[PDB]
C-alpha cells in the first residue's frame, strides 16, 4: 500500500478518475488514454505501483506532429496534407536531377518521439 | 533603494497612480501586456532586488498574425515570422505589374493583431 495518487502526465489521462483511494497497493495498475494531440506508442498504456511506492510506466503516448524535414537542395519537399502522424510527404528533384533514396516519407512512431520513416533524398548529377 | 518601475517593450505597470518615487527592496508591482502582446506567464511582476534594480522574467510574448494566403502569379516572402512587428514582402514574377503594397507589417488592430497592407495583385 505504498503508492499515492499517480503523477499528472503530459501525454495521457487516467481512464476512470473516480476511485478516490489516496493509497494504492503495490502492483495495482491504472489504465490510461492518450490526451488529444498525442498518439499511442506502446501496447501497454498503464501505470503500475511498484514496491517503493512510485508509479512505473514508459512513455506510451507521444506528440502526434513531426517537424518539417528541411529544404531539398535542387528539389522539392511537398506537404500533401500536414506533417502529422500517418501523413506522407513526397520528394521530387527539379531539372534532370537524379533522386537517390526514398521518394516519400511517412510521419511514424519512433524512439521517444515521432519521426520520418525515410530521410530527405539527394538530388545530384 | 529602487527608483520608479520602468515601462518595458512588452508591458507597462498596472495602476497608473504614477511614480511614488522610491521602492524598498522586495516590492513587487503588477504589469499588464502592451497591445500586440499576450500573457506568457502567471507571474506579471517586477521585483526590486538588493542592487536597486527591477528584475523580471519575460511574461508577455508577441501575438501572431496569420499567413495572408497565396499571391496569384507572385510570391509572398517571410523575412522573419508572422509575429507582431514582423514584416513580409511581396514580389511579382516575369514582368507583372505589382499594384498595391510591396510590403506588409504585422501590427495592432483594435483587440488583436493584423496586416497593415493586404495582398497585392499581379497584372498585365
Amino acid at each position: 500500500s505504498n503508492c499515492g495518487p499517480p503523477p499528472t502526465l503530459s501525454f495521457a489521462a487516467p481512464m476512470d478518475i473516480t476511485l478516490t483511494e489516496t493509497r494504492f497497493k503495490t502492483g495495482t495498475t491504472l489504465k490510461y488514454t492518450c490526451l488529444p494531440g498525442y498518439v499511442r506508442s506502446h501496447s501497454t498504456q498503464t501505470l503500475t505501483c511498484n514496491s517503493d511506492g512510485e508509479w512505473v510506466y514508459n512513455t506510451f503516448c507521444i506528440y502526434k506532429r513531426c517537424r518539417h524535414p528541411g529544404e531539398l537542395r535542387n528539389g522539392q519537399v511537398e506537404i500533401k496534407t500536414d506533417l502529422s502522424f500517418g501523413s506522407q510527404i513526397e520528394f521530387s528533384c527539379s531539372e534532370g536531377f537524379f533522386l537517390i533514396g526514398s521518394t516519400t516519407s511517412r510521419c511514424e512512431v519512433q524512439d521517444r518521439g515521432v519521426g520520418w520513416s525515410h530521410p530527405l533524398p539527394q538530388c545530384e548529377i | 533603494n529602487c527608483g520608479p518601475p520602468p515601462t518595458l517593450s512588452f508591458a507597462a505597470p498596472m495602476d497608473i497612480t504614477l511614480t511614488e518615487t522610491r521602492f524598498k527592496t522586495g516590492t513587487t508591482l503588477k504589469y499588464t501586456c502592451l497591445p500586440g502582446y499576450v500573457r506568457s506567464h502567471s507571474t506579471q511582476t517586477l521585483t526590486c532586488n538588493s542592487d536597486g534594480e527591477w528584475v523580471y522574467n519575460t511574461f508577455c510574448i508577441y501575438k501572431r498574425c496569420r499567413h495572408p494566403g497565396e499571391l496569384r502569379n507572385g510570391q509572398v516572402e517571410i523575412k522573419t515570422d508572422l509575429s507582431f512587428g514582423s514584416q513580409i514582402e511581396f514580389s511579382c514574377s516575369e514582368g507583372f505589374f505589382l499594384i498595391g503594397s510591396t510590403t506588409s507589417r504585422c501590427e495592432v488592430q483594435d483587440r488583436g493583431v493584423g496586416w497593415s497592407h493586404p495582398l497585392p495583385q499581379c497584372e498585365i
Partner: peptide, 28 residues
C-alpha cells in the same frame, strides 16, 4: 523559402509545449 519550414517547426514546438504547460497547471 526555408523560413516557412522554420516557422512550421517553431509553431509545432510551441504547440507541444503549450500543451505540456496546460497539463502542468492542471496538475496544480
Amino acid at each position: 523559402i526555408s523560413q516557412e519550414s522554420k516557422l512550421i517547426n517553431t509553431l509545432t514546438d510551441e504547440n507541444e509545449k503549450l500543451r505540456e504547460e496546460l497539463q502542468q497547471y492542471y496538475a496544480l
